[PDB]
Amino acid sequence: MQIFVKTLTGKTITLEVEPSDTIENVKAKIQDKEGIPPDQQRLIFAGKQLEDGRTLSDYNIQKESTLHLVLRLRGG
Amino acid sequence: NKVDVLCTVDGVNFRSCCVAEGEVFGKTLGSVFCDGINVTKVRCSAIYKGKVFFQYSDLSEADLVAVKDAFGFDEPQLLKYYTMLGMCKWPVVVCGNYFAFKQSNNNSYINVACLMLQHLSLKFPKWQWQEAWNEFRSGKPLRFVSLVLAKGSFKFNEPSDSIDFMRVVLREADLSGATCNLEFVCKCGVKQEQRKGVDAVMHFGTLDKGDLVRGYNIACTCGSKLVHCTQFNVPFLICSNTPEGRKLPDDVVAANIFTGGSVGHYTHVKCKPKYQLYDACNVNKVSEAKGNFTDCLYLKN
Numbered sequence: 162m163q164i165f166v167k168t169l170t171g172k173t174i175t176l177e178v179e180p181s182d183t184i185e186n187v188k189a190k191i192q193d194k195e196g197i198p199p200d201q202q203r204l205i206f207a208g209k210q211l212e213d214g215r216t217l218s219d220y221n222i223q224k225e226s227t228l229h230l231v232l233r234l235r236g237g
Numbered sequence: 238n239k240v241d242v243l244c245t246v247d248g249v250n251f252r253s254c255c256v257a258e259g260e261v262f263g264k265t266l267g268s269v270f271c272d273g274i275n276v277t278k279v280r281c282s283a284i285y286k287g288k289v290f291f292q293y294s295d296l297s298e299a300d301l302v303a304v305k306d307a308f309g310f311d312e313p314q315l316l317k318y319y320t321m322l323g324m325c326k327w328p329v330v331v332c333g334n335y336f337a338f339k340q341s342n343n344n345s346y347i348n349v350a351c352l353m354l355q356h357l358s359l360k361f362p363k364w365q366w367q368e369a370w371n372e373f374r375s376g377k378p379l380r381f382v383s384l385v386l387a388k389g390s391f392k393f394n395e396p397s398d399s400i401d402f403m404r405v406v407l408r409e410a411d412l413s414g415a416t417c418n419l420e421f422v423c424k425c426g427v428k429q430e431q432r433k434g435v436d437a438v439m440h441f442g443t444l445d446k447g448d449l450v451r452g453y454n455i456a457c458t459c460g461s462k463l464v465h466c467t468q469f470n471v472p473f474l475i476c477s478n479t480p481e482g483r484k485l486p487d488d489v490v491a492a493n494i495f496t497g498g499s500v501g502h503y504t505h506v507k508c509k510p511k512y513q514l515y516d517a518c519n520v521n522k523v524s525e526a527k528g529n530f531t532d533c534l535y536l537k538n
């Protein structure tokens with residue numbers, strides 16, 4: 162199935178995934194499309210942060226859902 | 238000729254253990270902390286009589302279960318905890334009703350996360366987290382900080398995200414009673430959801446609680462989707478967003494400010510009295526709240 166990821170640059174990414182994919186899986190796929198290291202990625206669904214170990218099905222992410230991708234801040 | 242001490246792996250159950258005077262503790266006890274210090278290579282003296290030694294080498298299956306129960310750690314996390322405990326010796330400064338850390342080892346994200354958490358009433362089911370939190374509230378935060386750094390993916394001396402520190406903490410707290418009712422409206426249709434726990438008290442995508450109350454639009458395949466909270470039932474709410482130099486929303490209790498680009502620096506403002514601006518351990522009264530805000534705390538009552 163397809164899901165969409167909206168980025169901070171404005172670009173919308175199209176991912177091919179299965180409901181059994183984990184958020185870690187999704188982040189790896191995002192790295193492949195965009196080159197962003199998974200450890201820098203924060204994924205959000207309608208305001209809720211998505212945890213690495215859970216699956217799309219766990220979050221009721223269905224076909225053609227749109228996630229939001231932001232980068233973790235680095236403040237020292 | 239032997240000093241009597243207490244050995245534990247979890248701070249819940251202890252066994253009497255004896256060490257010969259003059260002998261290095263590690264010889265008999267393995268790797269050990271006592272009063273937050275690694276004493277593995279310290280020679281046993283009577284000053285340590287009756288004190289508590291936390292062991293973390295050669296953990297049995299039963300010890301690992303006790304550590305999971307009291308810390309929520311597996312063995313690598315426990316070792317990371319004691320490494321962090323040994324390294325994070327940052328001075329703490331009291332500023333009226335609050336404390337803050339001197340600038341050190343890129344700890345600004347911890348400083349402002351801790352300044353925001355000092356407003357919260359939290360309880361922790363796991364014994365070590367509750368005890369470290371009590372010390373935190375008393376102005377001795379380093380044990381609590383070390384738990385968080387070990388529980389998360391944080392690397393010592395690396396700049397990081399204050400929201401990740403707060404989220405690691407809130408996932409350990411008992412937020413059983415916290416819920417919010419959300420409604421979503423777009424051309425796709427209308428759906429409801431009740432968020433619970435950490436998902437009820439943290440929201441990402443706006444700083445303004447009023448956006449949730451009124452509804453605000455996010456991207457959707459149909460164009461845009463309205464997100465609307467129809468009922469709040471939370472003791473507090475943290476609204477977070479990409480850093481933005483907007484006006485501080487109404488009713489905010491405290492806010493985190495992120496200044497810079499790829500790598501930046503956190504500051505923190507409190508709104509009673511309006512305003513107190515914290516930067517490391519400095520606090521100054523200012524007449525306006527400005528900067529690129531990234532987290533805003535709302536409190537009930």
Ligand SMILES: [Zn+2]
Nearest residue numbers: 423425457459
């Ligand atoms: Zn829609």
